[PDB]
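Ticket reopened. Same input as before:
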Amino acid sequence: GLVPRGSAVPLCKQALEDLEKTSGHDHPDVATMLNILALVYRDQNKYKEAAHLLNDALAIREKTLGKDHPAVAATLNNLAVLYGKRGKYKEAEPLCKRALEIREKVLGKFHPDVAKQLNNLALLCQNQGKAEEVEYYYRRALEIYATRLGPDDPNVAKTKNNLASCYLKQGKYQDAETLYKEILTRAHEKEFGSVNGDNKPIWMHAEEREESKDKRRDACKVDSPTVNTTLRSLGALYRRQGKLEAAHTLEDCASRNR
Amino acid sequence: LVPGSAVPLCKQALEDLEKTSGHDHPDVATMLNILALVYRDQNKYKEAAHLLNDALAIREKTLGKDHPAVAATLNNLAVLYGKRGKYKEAEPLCKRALEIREKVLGKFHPDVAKQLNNLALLCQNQGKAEEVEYYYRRALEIYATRLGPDDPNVAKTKNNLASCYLKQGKYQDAETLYKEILTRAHEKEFGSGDNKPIWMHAEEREESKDKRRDACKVDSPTVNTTLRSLGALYRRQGKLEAAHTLEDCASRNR
Amino acid sequence: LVPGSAVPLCKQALEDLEKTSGHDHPDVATMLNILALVYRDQNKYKEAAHLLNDALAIREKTLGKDHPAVAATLNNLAVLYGKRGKYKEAEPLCKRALEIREKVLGKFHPDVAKQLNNLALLCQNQGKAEEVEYYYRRALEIYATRLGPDDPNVAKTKNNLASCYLKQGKYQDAETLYKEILTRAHEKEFGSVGDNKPIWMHAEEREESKDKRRDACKVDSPTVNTTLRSLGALYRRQGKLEAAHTLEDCASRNR
Amino acid sequence: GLVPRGSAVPLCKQALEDLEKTSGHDHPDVATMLNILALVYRDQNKYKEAAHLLNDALAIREKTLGKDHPAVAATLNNLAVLYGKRGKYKEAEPLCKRALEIREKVLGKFHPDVAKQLNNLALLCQNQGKAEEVEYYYRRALEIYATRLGPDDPNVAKTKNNLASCYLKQGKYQDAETLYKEILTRAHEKEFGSVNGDNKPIWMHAEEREESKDKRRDACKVDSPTVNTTLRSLGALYRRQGKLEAAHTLEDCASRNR
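Engineering reply: fixed in the latest deploy. New output:
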């Protein structure tokens, strides 16, 4: 709460009433002031009050700027976020979906900011338990990240981890496994290059030690908070499959990078 | 959270108040504070801190050196200074806020703890390990008492204090803290010889030389971290099989 | 006096000083003052005054409430306030600058007069005629004494006080002042007076002798001309049109 | 003197040396900082020192921006001003004359800003006693003011007064007299609109009262600082010509508007 709880709201309301007297209600400057006031309310963790005003700012902006304006998308985003903070994910979704459409129209389907929007829509659907759809938006986002940015951009593996987790919820263990192994293979193929036959990724060592049931733990160097997550998540998969030694390989590898 | 046209419109509102009330008025300080909030939304932290320092100047002259609203401003300014890596400069301002908060609310009001937490964090980024130590301890004292012994904040602060010890090579003192946390969580559900914590089982599983690998009923995100941190300490000590007990337990709660 | 880009470049210099010395340092207050100067060059008096107030805040905490560099800041801030037409808020700042200046330099140091002159001008734009009166008299007191009785500033201040009297309907008090300036100027050239007579004496006697005849003329100064016409205006008010003509023709003959 | 006499120069010098180390000496930012430093010196009435730095700022700007850039015109104009403040009018003139050539090129011959530049050159030449050149520049300025702005713009009469004064120094009494009469005929008819024959300008009344052996001492509703100046100046002309009653008409008219 950067602004103290007293006097911020009434002083903003004055500044607002003053702008309304100059230009009338349907003016971009009123929408902007309504937006500043929403920012003040959000600073006090008053999400419902901020969303109510942002809705009023939204209607002004749709009229004066057009239903396809970038600032109309910015307002729909913020609104969805505010509904999300209240657990109102169902009613947030269409406003998020509407923001995506303007965003796609203005910037182009493959713009890195469309990727952020898609990521938010997937998140909204996830809190609703709509897995079919979480899956759709994460793929779309991954498609942008992996292509419009380098394949080893930090968002690639992050989105891949989120999508693998979505798969697990659906019981698509194969598709999750493949994703985790892609992240680990990519990271192994980045510090090294070709596999010499013994230049194997960690997960091949893991499964091969399960093959000869090796009760011994005593590949490491690969380091990232996201890769560590991948290492433990594939390890959780191996646990379900009853491959404890495999899990141990990846889990003990994760511990050494902590 | 905001969409140009924001700063300029605020600057009008400020001028209109200044016109009415004069510069030295709480409402002008507030409006500068509002304008700082807009700047911070645009990620302009130097500009935001400058305006908050202007708000501070007014509030000092109008409300007094020891006013609650002055403490809030000094704290917010310190947050902003911290965000630009100006930890050395934020420190005096954070100490000043603490003095006020202690005077106004008492030494042991929960809001003091959160202030003490920031002080610790401000010293850590400067590498003042001894002062971090003091501040976290001061915070823990309030958390473990004014809220329950098994409050989320208690275990968080104990991990944070433990990491501080780790940087000083006080492995003993860090160890003790992790055990306290786990022993509490094992005692929150049982407890309290007939009933041994996991770390005890772990160390007994090296005492018996038990290579056969893979109490395991604790559920908390903070406790997982604790388990992996103590296992890290066993690794340093060479007690690799003791590490596995706590780490496999963590994996099983993930 | 300068060509954009100046403010941004200054803000870097300012940030570099804060980085080195912290916010509460004289050099930061100075750089803010320098940045105020740049803003004032671009006619941005609001932004200039704001930065000077920031400089003031620093100099107060670092140098003290009574430091000469604070007085300079308070005065400069007041000038800028006045330029935006906020004379009410400029007044307290100006008074404080006077208190510091009196303390540090003495009551009667020439630099106090110019500060008293600002106060007078500041009170005038508010219409506080009694205050204006006090300040100009206080300033005159320093001018007529410290510098020579017939120093440029003495006649300037007498006219300014006389104009103040005119707004209050103190026509008689204004009249006296103009005659003082004219009698002094008639003494600096001719000597101790008669039958050396100042022009205003001849003028009123020309009215006294009902003479409508028309064109003493050895009094040269831009300030004296103003005085001649100002006293002529007073005679016009009184009805003494022939007395007015005498002083106004003398001014015309020195133009 | 808005900046305190101490430390302001060293701190600027620091800022400058920092810029020189980042972008080299021949960078516009160095020229701008040299300019800021010149502003600081001017605030302390150190004209010679401010001019020296501005000269260095000019050299950088001529090379980096080109010898015809508006900022080169601004620096030349600022430099002539400073020379003028030291009474160095001869050496100021070419620089001020160069600013005019750049200004004419960039804005066009009849831009109101060219009218101000011409006015400055006229001022420089006047301080030198070069009355033939003063005349040429005031005419050029008047030509712009009277056409690019309304005929009864404040600068029209101001420039006409300046030009009439220039004429008096040369002994061109008739040309001065004509100018004064134009300003008063303009203002008289701006008050009325049409001359009925009874509706005469003040100076016609002045010369007619001089004609008829008239006594005769006291149309005067024309209020302006620059018109009173015109009234007293034409009055001085009448005095010169021995027409005292005519002088008195205009002089008593100016007294009524004081």
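Chain A has one domain: 1-258. The domain at 1-258 of chain A is CATH 1.25.40.10 (Serine Threonine Protein Phosphatase 5, Tetratricopeptide repeat). Please confirm and we'll close it.
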